[PDB]
Amino acid sequence: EQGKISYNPITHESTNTTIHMTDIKDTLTEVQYKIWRTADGKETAKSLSSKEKEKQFSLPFDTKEFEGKRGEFQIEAIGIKEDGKTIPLTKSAITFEQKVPVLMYHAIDDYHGQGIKDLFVSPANFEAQMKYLKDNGYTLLTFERWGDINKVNKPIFVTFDDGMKNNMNAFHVLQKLKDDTFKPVATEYMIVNNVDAEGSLSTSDIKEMVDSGIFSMQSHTATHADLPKITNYEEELKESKEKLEKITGKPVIAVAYPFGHVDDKVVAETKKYYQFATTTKPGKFITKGEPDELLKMKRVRIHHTTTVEQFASSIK
Ligand SMILES: [Zn+2]
């Protein structure tokens, strides 16, 4: 209704700032800022008062005042007159960017000597890892909720590469762990030409995974192409997306680069067709506002030998 909330510029590395108000029309003795973390809910709000009238009702803000937590904080300001009358001012928000681990799995199966050992995580160990997420308040997301990474507690993306049939084991584990509190979701990056192939997810598997609300079915190209070395970008990137959309009935907005192989040319081609692209560069993503950063997203590799302790250290 009146006034404008501003704050000293922050970056993704910032932990604090100072809030100010300008353009106030009423005469005030005090401004009260009601602040809460979106992720924790308005019911958890506190109110912080400034009587620094000569300094635009300056209010120091530090994430230390909110248990060291980050993400989006909502701000509602009211003014107080000398006689105590309250005056509605305005609302805004400030976001301290949260890190987002993007986990990379391949096979979820008991290894029996067939295939590349490191790329197998047993269903038992996968369950233990997912149970860790469940027990520690992580919010599992898919790229349809990219806009929510700062609006939830402990955002994390569980992803699988290739569309192996054994990923139905991961699906079943997630169905088991799902309950009134834990709402798991995950991304499957499907080698699109392998739908219904021996060893891969079938059309019926994909429909079950998608219809359950658990899986977001995204692209791993048409043939798992070494993108810097191919020229058929429409076939590998565009037509794979289109074919997969016809199968799932849901938008395809994300891809994973086969082998983690990517260069500026590949990013530019990918940008034509996908909003999101993940690499195999190790680490957690954070929003830096860097050019095409969402098409160069780091991932955390899970190994055959990864323990729950190692898993926890790599995401926390
Ligand atoms: Zn792959």
Numbering used by the authors: 45 to 360
The paper states:
BA0330 and BA0331 are the only lipoproteins among the 11 known or putative polysaccharide deacetylases of Bacillus anthracis. BA0330 and BA0331 from B. anthracis are predicted as lipoproteins and putative PDAs and share 55% sequence identity. BA0330 and BA0331 interact with peptidoglycan, and BA0330 is important for the adaptation of the bacterium to grow in the presence of a high concentration of salt, whereas BA0331 contributes to the maintenance of a uniform cell shape. Our data suggest that BA0330 and BA0331 have a structural role in stabilizing the cell wall of B. anthracis.
